[PDB]
Every structure is written in structure tokens, then in C-alpha cells.
Scaffold this active site. Structure first.
Site, PDB file in Angstrom:
ATOM      1  N   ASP A 111      89.327 100.215  55.536  1.00 53.80           N
ATOM      2  CA  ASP A 111      88.137 100.346  54.707  1.00 53.80           C
ATOM      3  C   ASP A 111      86.905 100.709  55.527  1.00 53.80           C
ATOM      4  OD1 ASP A 111      89.062 100.222  52.151  1.00 53.80           O
ATOM      5  OD2 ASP A 111      88.638  98.088  51.838  1.00 53.80           O
ATOM      6  N   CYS A 118      90.547 113.278  50.728  1.00 56.84           N
ATOM      7  CA  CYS A 118      90.316 111.842  50.787  1.00 56.84           C
ATOM      8  C   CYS A 118      89.480 111.613  49.532  1.00 56.84           C
ATOM      9  CB  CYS A 118      89.639 111.429  52.091  1.00 56.84           C
ATOM     10  SG  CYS A 118      88.360 112.563  52.731  1.00 56.84           S
ATOM     11  N   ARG A 131      87.931 111.717  56.590  1.00 54.83           N
ATOM     12  CA  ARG A 131      89.351 111.616  56.941  1.00 54.83           C
ATOM     13  C   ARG A 131      90.007 112.986  56.903  1.00 54.83           C
ATOM     14  NH1 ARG A 131      88.675 107.775  53.277  1.00 54.83           N
ATOM     15  NH2 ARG A 131      90.326 106.191  53.289  1.00 54.83           N
ATOM     16  N   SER A 132      89.706 113.741  55.858  1.00 51.41           N
ATOM     17  CA  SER A 132      90.281 115.073  55.704  1.00 51.41           C
ATOM     18  C   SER A 132      89.920 115.959  56.892  1.00 51.41           C
ATOM     19  CB  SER A 132      89.778 115.730  54.417  1.00 51.41           C
ATOM     20  OG  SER A 132      90.277 115.040  53.276  1.00 51.41           O
ATOM     21  N   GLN A 146      82.589 112.536  59.383  1.00 49.21           N
ATOM     22  CA  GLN A 146      81.417 111.920  58.752  1.00 49.21           C
ATOM     23  C   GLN A 146      80.591 111.011  59.652  1.00 49.21           C
ATOM     24  OE1 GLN A 146      82.880 110.855  54.328  1.00 49.21           O
ATOM     25  NE2 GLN A 146      80.699 111.362  54.576  1.00 49.21           N
TER      26      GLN A 146
END
EC number: 3.1.3.48
Length: 299
Positions: free
Chosen positions: A181, A215, A221-222, A262
Site C-alpha cells: 500500500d 495500475c 507501478r505501470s 510517481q
């Protein structure tokens, strides 16, 4: 090798935050006019994440061709990816239309439907064989054929049918279920094990349409997944773990979709993954087995 030289220098200086900010500042800025049209407001999951007009995927559709998805076309590496947001309750039909039209073989999902107690993605695929899904708006049928549940990820075989032509295709769904998370999964090993499972499936290969990666927003994540795959592919093609400049590759990718990677943690993780994956690329075939062990996929 050399990115590992930089890695240690950045780690010694504790300058990841600054390195990452440099990326943000230099990254491309292109118009996203279609994404921002009023008729499209309900097709976007996040107001601050939109596909550039020049690289957006167009639905082969009358009325409205818009979906929040970008074609990332890596010229030198000779690999393409479609990055997209997690589908919304009203865009699941569009999502599967895209997979059909772009001739994709694989879909890579890097998030869970629920994270941090809220819904990050619609339930866009069937959870039970006997309960298939029909997307009436795009006239597609989707059936779960089988699933292989492992410790850190699940692979599903799906059958997608164009109800118009009754043509059917097998789509593989690779679902990484254990991305934490909050803080990047400090095991480059399970991430690499997973990336190599996707590669082994043929989903990334030139004879199929681009793999679809998502994602929640389709950038973090992608972005990590695609950046690591491309860097490793380049190192493979040149067989030279030194010519590959990860920041340069990331900037090239950001020409095609904004905001990939990110934060500084994800950037540092991307380096780690590439550095570790390089062992395999350069001839140490036994490392893949080592990752599989470290990535206890059985529990």
C-alpha cells in the site's frame, strides 16, 4: 556495472528526491485536449492524469473514440506498451474494445481492486468460470477459462469474444497482487520473477499487439514495469549494461505519457530492478531460479 556506480553515488549523497525532481522538470509537456473535453469527464479516473493527444489510443468507435490510454512506442528497444488507468465502472467495455482492436495478447495489472480502503479499479474481469461478462455497449463477451494463483501474483487465462464476428481470442491476465500500500516492494526479486513470467508468456512479443499495462492511474507501478523491461531489453540488444541510461530511457517514455514513475522511491526501485535483472541478461541464467526461490510463490 555503471548504473550501479551512479546508484551508489546517489545513495551516498541521499539525493534521490532531487534526482527525481530533475526528471519532473525536464519531462515533456504535450497537449491533452481530447482528454479534457466535457463529454470525456466521466472517462477519466484522475483529473491530473491524462493521455497526450499525440499518443492516445483511439477506440475504433463512432460517437466517442476516447479512452484514457497511451501508446508507449520504444523505437530502439523495438517494444511497445499501452499504459492505461484502471477501468471505471463505465469504461470496462471501452477497455476490452481497446484490447481487441490493438490485438493485445496480455494485460498486466499491478494493483488490487481495493487499496488503502478505497476502490482503485473496477472488477473488469470475471472471477468465476460459470459467470461470464457481457459488455453490451461494445458487444464483447469475456469468460474466465482458468487461473493460477501464486503467492505474489495470479495468472488468468481469459477468452475474449467479439460478439459481432463471433471471433475469439485468448488473453492472458498477469496480476501482481502484492505491491505494498505504501512503500515499494524492496524485493527486486519478486518483481523480476513476475516480469519474466510475462515475457515468457509471449505477451510482450512483436507478433502480438502491445501489452496493456495498468495500475490505478497507469503511471506509477505501470511506469516502473515498463521502464525496467525496456532497460533490460536494451542491455540485451547491445549486451552492454553500460550504455543504458535509465534516466534517459525514462525521459523518452515520458514523451508518450505524463508522470511515469510517481516518486523517488519508485525511481530508486527501478534502478535496483534493472541492476539485479542485469545478472540474468549477461549470462548468469541460474539467477532466475534464485528469484523464484526468493519470491516464495507458494507460501
Amino acid at each position: 556495472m555503471e548504473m550501479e556506480k551512479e546508484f551508489e553515488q546517489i545513495d551516498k549523497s541521499g539525493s534521490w528526491a532531487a534526482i527525481y525532481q530533475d526528471i519532473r522538470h525536464e519531462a515533456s509537456d504535450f497537449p491533452c485536449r481530447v482528454a479534457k473535453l466535457p463529454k470525456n469527464k466521466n472517462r477519466n479516473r484522475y483529473r491530473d492524469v491524462s493521455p497526450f493527444d499525440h499518443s492516445r489510443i483511439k477506440l475504433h468507435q463512432e460517437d466517442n473514440d476516447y479512452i484514457n490510454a497511451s501508446l508507449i512506442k520504444m523505437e530502439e528497444a523495438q517494444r511497445s506498451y499501452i499504459l492505461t488507468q484502471g477501468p471505471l465502472p463505465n469504461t470496462c467495455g471501452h477497455f476490452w474494445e481497446m484490447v481487441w482492436e490493438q490485438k493485445s495478447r496480455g494485460v498486466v495489472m499491478l494493483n488490487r481492486v481495493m487499496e488503502k480502503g478505497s476502490l482503485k479499479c473496477a472488477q473488469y474481469w470475471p472471477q468465476k468460470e460459470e459467470k461470464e461478462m457481457i459488455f453490451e455497449d461494445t458487444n464483447l463477451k469475456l469468460t474466465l477459462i482458468s487461473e493460477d494463483i501464486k503467492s505474489y501474483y495470479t495468472v488468468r487465462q481469459l477468452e475474449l469474444e467479439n460478439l459481432t464476428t463471433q471471433e475469439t481470442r485468448e488473453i492472458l491476465h498477469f496480476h501482481y497482487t502484492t505491491w505494498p500500500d505504501f512503500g515499494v516492494p524492496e524485493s527486486p526479486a519478486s518483481f523480476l520473477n513476475f516480469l519474466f513470467k510475462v515475457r515468457e508468456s509471449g505477451s510482450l512479443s512483436p507478433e502480438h499487439g502491445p501489452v496493456v499495462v495498468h495500475c490505478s492511474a497507469g503511471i506509477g507501478r505501470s511506469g516502473t514495469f515498463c521502464l525496467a523491461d525496456t532497460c533490460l531489453l536494451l542491455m540485451d540488444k547491445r549486451k552492454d549494461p553500460s550504455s543504458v541510461d535509465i534516466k534517459k530511457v525514462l525521459l523518452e517514455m515520458r514523451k508518450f505519457r505524463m508522470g511515469l514513475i510517481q516518486n523517488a522511491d519508485q525511481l530508486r526501485f527501478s534502478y535496483l530492478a534493472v541492476i539485479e535483472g542485469a545478472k540474468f541478461i549477461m549470462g548468469d541464467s541460474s539467477v532466475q531460479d534464485q528469484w523464484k526461490e526468493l519470491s516464495h510463490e507458494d507460501l
